[PDB]
Amino acid sequence: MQASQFSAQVLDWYDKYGRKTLPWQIDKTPYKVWLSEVMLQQTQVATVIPYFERFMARFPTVTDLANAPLDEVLHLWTGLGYYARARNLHKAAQQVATLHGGKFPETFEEVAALPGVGRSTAGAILSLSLGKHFPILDGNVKRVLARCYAVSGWPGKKEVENKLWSLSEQVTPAVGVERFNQAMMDLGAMICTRSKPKCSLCPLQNGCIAAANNSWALYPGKKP
Numbered sequence: 171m172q173a174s175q176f177s178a179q180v181l182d183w184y185d186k187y188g189r190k191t192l193p194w195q196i197d198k199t200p201y202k203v204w205l206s207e208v209m210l211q212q213t214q215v216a217t218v219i220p221y222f223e224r225f226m227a228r229f230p231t232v233t234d235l236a237n238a239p240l241d242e243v244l245h246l247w248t249g250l251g252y253y254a255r256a257r258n259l260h261k262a263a264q265q266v267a268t269l270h271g272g273k274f275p276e277t278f279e280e281v282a283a284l285p286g287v288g289r290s291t292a293g294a295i296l297s298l299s300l301g302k303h304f305p306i307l308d309g310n311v312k313r314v315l316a317r318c319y320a321v322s323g324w325p326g327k328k329e330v331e332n333k334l335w336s337l338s339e340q341v342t343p344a345v346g347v348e349r350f351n352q353a354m355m356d357l358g359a360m361i362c363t364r365s366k367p368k369c370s371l372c373p374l375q376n377g378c379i380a381a382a383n384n385s386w387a388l389y390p391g392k393k394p
């Protein structure tokens with residue numbers, strides 16, 4: 171599929187069917203988007219929403235989170251699992267208070283330098299909260315791109331990962347970047363699922379190589 175057609179079809183789908191009313195999407199800030207991305211990394215949306223609301227009520231700014239005792243952060247995290255995320259969350263809040271005056275940094279290198287934040291989460295924070303022109307590559311996005319463009323091979327091998335990052339950059343537009351990056355996460359979470367994808371509901375079905383060959387099970391590749 172030509173990249174400009176990919177972007178236009180995904181944006182038209184989002185306008186009619188996309189999720190726009192999650193709490194981190196209303197009066198968006200870098201702090202709210204960062205907190206939601208860390209909670210969503212390993213936990214479903216329905217479980218995350220009450221924890222997001224409790225964290226924002228207790229810690230209205232990143233300085234309030236930084237100044238709290240770690241034991242209180244761990245207590246409020248209880249039930250989310252994968253507590254390395256919470257230890258890194260508290261360290262990153264302290265780095266923003268100490269190096270950046272309590273104001274979330276707005277440059278890619280300073281965001282990616284935070285503990286718990288890699289290349290995809292840094293691009294998510296700056297694209298979704300401020301409209302900066304960065305692509306994302308989480309598990310949802312890897313599945314949609316690898317099926318549509320027939321990218322075989324395990325993404326745990328550097329050459330496969332690099333091919334996927336180049337494809338993601340190519341299809342991600344500048345105009346509408348915040349809508350496009352949320353739409354790709356919606357598609358991989360609800361339509362282009364691990365098993366038995368819902369291709370009849372998918373805005374890419376007219377150009378997707380996996381759909382044309384009924385070969386979704388080949389993409390992305392699994393670890394050998």
Ligand code: SF4
Pocket residue numbers: 314317318361362363367368369372373374375378379380381386
């Ligand atoms: S048409 Fe089917 S396999 Fe292709 S991107 Fe959409 S849901 Fe995934």
